[PDB]
Amino acid sequence: QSLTDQILSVEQRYKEKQENLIRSEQIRREEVIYNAEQKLSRQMKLEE
């Protein structure tokens, strides 16, 4: 029963390293996209 409690605890710890992974991937794709949107702003250089 303790092992079950261990097991669940560790499973939650495994999720943490994987939340870090999901956020790493999700945040990163958006970061690339809104680096791409810098060209919206270069096309604002156009306004300039």
- Read off the tokens for 14: 């495994």
Experimental method: cryo-EM
- Read off the tokens for 33: 């996209």
Q: Residue 47, SS3?
A: coil
Q: How far are the Cα atoms of 12, 16, 42, 46 from residue 5, in angstroms, in the given order?
A: 11, 17, 55, 61
b/e code 2-29 from CB counts within 10 Å (16+ = b): eeeeeeeeeeeeeeeeeeeeeeeeeeee
d(CA 6, CA 21): 23
User: Please, where are the H alpha helices in the chain?
Assistant: 2-36, 38-45
**Residue 38 CA from chain centroid, whole number:** 20
Residue type, 14: Y
- Read off the tokens for 21: 């992974």
